[PDB]
Design a protein around this ligand. Structure first.
Ligand code: GBA
Ligand code: MG
Length: 390
């Protein structure tokens, strides 16, 4: 009579990392890629022989900086002249060119100079997320919900749909990232009455706070605030500067001019930063870091917390601003939701919990997975085609 329908998927198409989920058997499964990773870098690399996407692209970035594209989400649906674009271009090793006041990334690929629109780079990331899902389900996937930041305008939203269409996906809906995080906790299934929800999203490079009101499952964005210059990479930078100074004190050598040694130090610092979220101290062990000198050291969570203290405290300024814009007092917030890997930092959690006078934070769904989780819940709802009984 009627063939079984393929599952629809939920994709968090992130600036630095993307995540895919599927709602089946009354629950969400966040799908790991073929290297066992539950999140995939939003990176695309180009060589004379291949196009690499995800972990394979990010793992070769050091020696191929000019032809490895990342951060396409910062360009999507924007004009080349936009001041945001012009400032961001100074930090990127790849070329961004002007094509009719529209930015394009220009790379060396398969023996030629090729330029791509940001939606084309995002479609490559979406193709990888679709393949990750099909490897788990064991059949082709057609339908998807894709999330975007709440501040995305019409052009940015249409360019995200265009990326989905290029990837061969049927885009069921473009939904806001804070709305998807709320859906992940079922905050739209609590019945009649208004609920005020604050989403605290601390990423690799940016910080976003959103205030939503939910009434009978209807969402309204009440306020957005944030800091474009605050994220996980800034905490890594503080550790890098600390260990460069430490190497100077201990061995009377400045390593800061050997890119390989700085990169090896930063890679170790980011892993040490992650360990410090679960442990009170972490070891740093690098062999032949500079001039054949082995760098075997440690850092306590207390010292890391002191190094980033001003950065962690500054997350409360957009929270207070968002509350003023929404015209709400902190006691009026019913639910607090954490989004982004950087929210696992115990001190970040303590500062926010203390600001909301000891309130519990919703952090049970992995914060780097909550957005894809909610997108997967929505995708399963949107494909239902139930016919009413008499
Ligand atoms: N457990 C963790 N504790 C502290 N930070 C973390 C953790 N896990 C992740 Br993921 N991050 C950081 O989140 C950002 C995601 O783009 C990057 O800066 C990661 O370093
Ligand atoms: Mg995100």
């Amino acid at each position: 009579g009627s063939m079984a329908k393929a599952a629809a998927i939920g994709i968090d198409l992130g600036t630095t990392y993307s995540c895919v989920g599927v709602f089946q058997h009354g629950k969400v499964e966040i799908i790991a890629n073929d290297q066992g990773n539950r999140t995939t870098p939003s990176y695309v690399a180009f060589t004379d022989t291949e196009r690499l996407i995800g972990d394979a692209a990010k793992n070769q970035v050091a020696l191929n900086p000019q032809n490895t594209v990342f951060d396409a989400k910062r360009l999507i649906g924007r004009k080349f002249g936009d001041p945001v674009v012009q400032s961001d271009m100074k930090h990127w090793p790849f070329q961004v060119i002007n094509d009719g006041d529209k930015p394009k990334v220009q790379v060396s690929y398969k023996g030629e100079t090729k330029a791509f629109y940001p939606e084309e780079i995002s479609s490559m990331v979406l193709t990888k997320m679709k393949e990750i899902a099909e490897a788990y389900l064991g059949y082709p996937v057609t339908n998807a919900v894709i999330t975007v930041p709440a501040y995305f305008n019409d052009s940015q939203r249409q360019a995200t749909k265009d990326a989905g269409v290029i990837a061969g996906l049927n885009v069921l809906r473009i939904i806001n990232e804070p709305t998807a995080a709320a859906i992940a906790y079922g905050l739209d299934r609590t019945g009649k009455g208004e609920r005020n929800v604050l989403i605290f999203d601390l990423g690799g490079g940016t910080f976003d706070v959103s205030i939503l009101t939910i009434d009978d499952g209807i969402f309204e964005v009440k306020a957005t605030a944030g800091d474009t210059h605050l994220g996980g990479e800034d905490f890594d930078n503080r550790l890098v500067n600390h260990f460069v100074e430490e190497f100077k004190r201990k061995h009377k050598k400045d390593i800061s001019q050997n890119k390989r040694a700085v990169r090896r130090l930063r890679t170790a610092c980011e892993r040490a930063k992650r360990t410090l979220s679960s442990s009170t101290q972490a070891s740093l062990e690098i062999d032949s870091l500079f001039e054949g000198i082995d760098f075997y050291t440690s850092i306590t969570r207390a010292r890391f917390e002191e190094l980033c203290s001003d950065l962690f405290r500054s997350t409360l300024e957009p929270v207070e601003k968002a509350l003023r814009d929404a015209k709400l007092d902190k006691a009026q917030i019913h639910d607090l939701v954490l989004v982004g890997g950087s929210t696992r930092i115990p001190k970040v959690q303590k500062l926010l919990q203390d600001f909301f006078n000891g309130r519990d934070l919703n952090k049970s769904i992995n914060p780097d997975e909550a957005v894809a989780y909610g997108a997967a819940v929505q995708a399963a709802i949107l494909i239902k085609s139930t016919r009413a009984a008499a």
